[PDB]
Write a protein that binds this ligand. Structure first.
Ligand SMILES: *[C@@H]1O[C@H](CO[C@@H]2O[C@@H](C)[C@@H](O)[C@@H](O)[C@@H]2O)[C@@H](O[C@@H]2O[C@H](CO)[C@@H](O[C@@H]3O[C@H](CO)[C@@H](O)[C@H](O)[C@@H]3O)[C@H](O)[C@H]2NC(C)=O)[C@H](O)[C@H]1NC(C)=O
Ligand code: A1I5A
Ligand SMILES: *[C@@H]1O[C@H](CO)[C@@H](O[C@@H]2O[C@H](CO)[C@@H](O)[C@H](O)[C@H]2NC(C)=O)[C@H](O)[C@H]1NC(C)=O
Ligand SMILES: *[C@@H]1O[C@H](CO[C@@H]2O[C@@H](C)[C@@H](O)[C@@H](O)[C@@H]2O)[C@@H](O)[C@H](O)[C@H]1NC(C)=O
Ligand code: CL
Ligand code: NA
Ligand code: ZN
Length: 604
């Protein structure tokens, strides 16, 4: 560790702790910068040499964390929790958590190499028949093919290609992860991840929210399944069974907006999927980012800096390069560089993704002057919800009209149902998946799910929550969890479930603040500078204050609450119920064992 990056001496008291944190800050920014830069060089240009550089950057970060972590303990262990400066308690709190820096060097190198290889396997996997990548090829097939066999080929090929090779590495990762966080005093890595919400009743709180949301999901499910039956027939759709996992428009069945064309109740109202118009009008990636930016400046939030437009990767490279395509927003921790890396396609759902990612950037811009340790969301759910909140306004027919993507506007009950259904396919359908992923991982971390039940426990949860089944037989050679990015990339998931609740709480608060008086799902906060100021206050706080308090100041409540989401969707909730009753549907999938047959001519 460079002389310049090592900790010196400070008095063992609060005034010295302030001096400590300031000195940490100065060297931390240099260490984070080099680490994020090496990650960037790799992820926008995957090569062995880039990987080796990234691995060395990670080791350097571990060394830093160890020196400053050990020093924070040495000087402040008896007294940090009693400090008068609450920001300073949070900073010391973060600095003394060593994580992977608790590993001896040899396990460090093994841990870093495992992360690097899991990521390289996920992002370079291909399905060959001439090889299809996940982005754009397999995404497009899953989104717009309607051929059972083609969808099955893409689904099965992806799951096999990414998942199977990941399993030995993921087992070794899990062991070392646990070994690391056990030395910081947690039972397993999952306990550590859960501690970020600082809520003794976290798991119970989540389960109480899910119980209120599940009826909506059950009703959406029944309706969609019925629509699928009418297209695919009773051989491949069981009206009392789970839905085959390849038919819902997405590789993970995680959101269903791409099958909107199959379920839309009133098809001679305005077409609410504007992808065509976007293509017809010749939208490019850059237009999508500029349109998102302009929403943000309409609120008197910050524009993207020059360094964002010069630095970002906003399209998949056409040169020789292999890249990580999964969309991400990057803070280089130097108060100056911020970038998005996305293999942007010209679709409506990607317009939302652009907003999601710009939400991350906007947070980075607003809190960049805080101490590095506080440069994060009030909780991880907050960071994931910013961009989605704006995208709720953008997707309203009224707003789409204003930006030239919808000629006709209508304000009638049929158009509303169409709109709310489209939104339920995006939002309601995700809830079970958003909940289940970390249940899987918590079980793996705690040892409840050993390697010998990875796929068994995955599909138990996928069926339990989502009501889907694999369209071909799976066994424990398969590692279907590892065919989802966040798993080999070691990115927590529960944040997305929290996000999907939070974003409706935020939407209701910002619509109220903007003076809007109509139904929640028709609110557009565009150009509301009052809404901007309320949102800006959250962003600027970073993690400096308890998330419960930040939320209370924003929405008038100190807890996650499903009531705003329920109110948003009220009309379609009522309507789907009535439709399912009228059609004689069974809610749920009591034939839980059912799986579809293979096609006759398959794979050939
Ligand atoms: C789409 O249409 C709805 C419904 O509009 C109502 O019924 C229609 C058939 C017409 O007769 C309309 O004239 C009628 O308002 C619109 O929602 C309605 O918005 C208004 C305000 O924009 C709401 O009124 C407010 O009520 C509060 C008290 O509760 C007062 O303090 C305010 O001064 C204001 O009068 C009204 O509650 C609301 N009604 C419903 C059904 O919720 C909706 O705004 C419109 N959509 C768009 C995007 O224009
Ligand atoms: C596109 C996005 N990408 C992550 C990237 C997270 C990441 C963290 C650390 C290193 C690399 C990447 C994000 O920015 O958070 C995403 O992964 N989802 C958002 C999203 C948006 C709408 C609906 C659901 C979700 C969940 C999630 C997903 O698509 O699975
Ligand atoms: C992708 O990364 C490689 C390194 O892994 C880059 O190649 C280096 O480029 C510099 C400047 O042209 C050369 O001096 C080095 O000798 C190259 N190293 C190797 C081992 O090839 C490459 O330029 C990167 N590609 C892009 C488009 O950024
Ligand atoms: C796991 O499965 C592999 C591939 O085939 C799968 O199982 C057979 C029986 C078919 O039903 C097929 O549709 C499935 O996808 C096998 O090659 C493998 O040996 C199986 N068992 C083990 C222990 O890996
Ligand atoms: Cl999280
Ligand atoms: Na999609
Ligand atoms: Zn995100």
């Amino acid at each position: 560790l460079d002389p310049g990056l090592q900790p010196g001496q400070f008095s063992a008291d609060e005034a010295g702790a302030q001096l400590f944190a300031q000195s940490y800050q100065s060297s931390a920014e240099q260490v984070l910068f080099q680490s994020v830069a090496a990650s960037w060089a790799h992820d926008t240009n995957i090569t062995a040499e880039n990987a080796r550089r990234q691995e060395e950057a990670a080791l350097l970060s571990q060394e830093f964390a160890e020196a400053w972590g050990q020093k924070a303990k040495e000087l402040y262990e008896p007294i940090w929790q009693q400090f008068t400066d609450p920001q300073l308690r949070r900073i010391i709190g973060a600095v003394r958590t060593l994580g992977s820096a608790n590993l001896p060097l040899a396990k460090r190198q093994q841990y870093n190499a495992l992360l690097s290889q899991m990521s390289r396997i996920y992002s370079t996997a291909k399905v060959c028949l001439t090889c299809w990548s996940l982005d754009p090829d397999l995404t497009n097939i899953l989104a717009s093919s309607r051929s059972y066999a083609m969808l099955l080929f893409a689904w099965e090929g992806w799951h096999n290609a990414a998942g199977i090779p990941l399993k030995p590495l993921y087992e070794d990762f899990t062991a070392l992860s646990n070994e690391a966080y056990k030395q910081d005093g947690f039972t397993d890595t999952g306990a550590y991840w859960r501690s970020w919400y600082n809520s003794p009743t976290f798991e119970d709180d989540l389960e109480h929210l899910y119980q209120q949301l599940e009826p909506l999901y059950l009703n959406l499910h029944a309706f969609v399944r019925r629509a699928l039956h009418r297209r695919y027939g009773d051989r491949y759709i069981n009206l009392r069974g789970p839905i085959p996992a390849h038919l819902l428009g997405d590789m993970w069945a995680q959101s269903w907006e791409n099958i909107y064309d199959m379920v839309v109740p009133f098809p001679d109202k305005p077409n609410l999927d504007v992808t065509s118009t976007m293509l017809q009008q010749g939208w490019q990636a850059t237009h999508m980012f500029r349109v998102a930016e302009e929403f943000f400046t309409s609120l008197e939030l910050s524009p993207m800096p020059p360094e964002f437009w010069e630095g970002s990767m906003l399209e998949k490279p056409a040169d020789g390069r292999e890249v990580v395509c999964h969309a991400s927003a990057w803070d280089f921790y130097n108060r100056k560089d911020f970038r998005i890396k996305q293999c942007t396609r010209v679709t409506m759902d990607q317009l939302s993704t652009v907003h999601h990612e710009m939400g991350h950037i906007q947070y980075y811009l607003q809190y960049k002057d805080l101490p590095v340790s506080l440069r994060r969301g009030a909780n991880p759910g907050f960071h994931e919800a910013i961009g989605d909140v704006l995208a709720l306004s953008v997707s309203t027919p009224e707003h789409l009209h204003k930006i030239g993507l919808l000629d006709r506007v209508t304000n009638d009950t049929e158009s509303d149902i169409n709109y709310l259904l489209k939104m339920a396919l995006e939002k309601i359908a995700f809830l079970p998946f958003g909940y289940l992923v970390d249940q899987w991982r918590w079980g793996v971390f705690s040892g409840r799910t050993p390697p010998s039940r990875y796929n068994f426990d995955w599909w138990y949860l996928r069926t339990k929550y989502q009501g889907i089944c694999p369209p071909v037989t799976r066994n424990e050679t398969h590692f279907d969890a590892g065919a989802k990015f966040h798993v080999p990339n070691v990115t927590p998931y529960i944040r997305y479930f929290v996000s999907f609740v939070l974003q409706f709480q935020f939407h209701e608060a910002l619509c109220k603040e903007a003076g809007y008086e109509g139904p929640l799902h028709q609110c557009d906060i565009y150009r509301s500078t009052k809404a901007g100021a309320k949102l800006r206050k959250v962003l600027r706080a970073g993690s400096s204050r308890p998330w419960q308090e930040v939320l209370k100041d924003m929405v008038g409540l100190d807890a996650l609450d499903a009531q705003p989401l329920l109110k948003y969707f009220q009309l379609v909730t009522q309507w789907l119920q009535e439709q399912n009753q009228q059609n004689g549907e069974v809610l749920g999938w009591p034939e839980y064992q059912w799986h579809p047959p293979l096609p006759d001519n398959y794979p050939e």
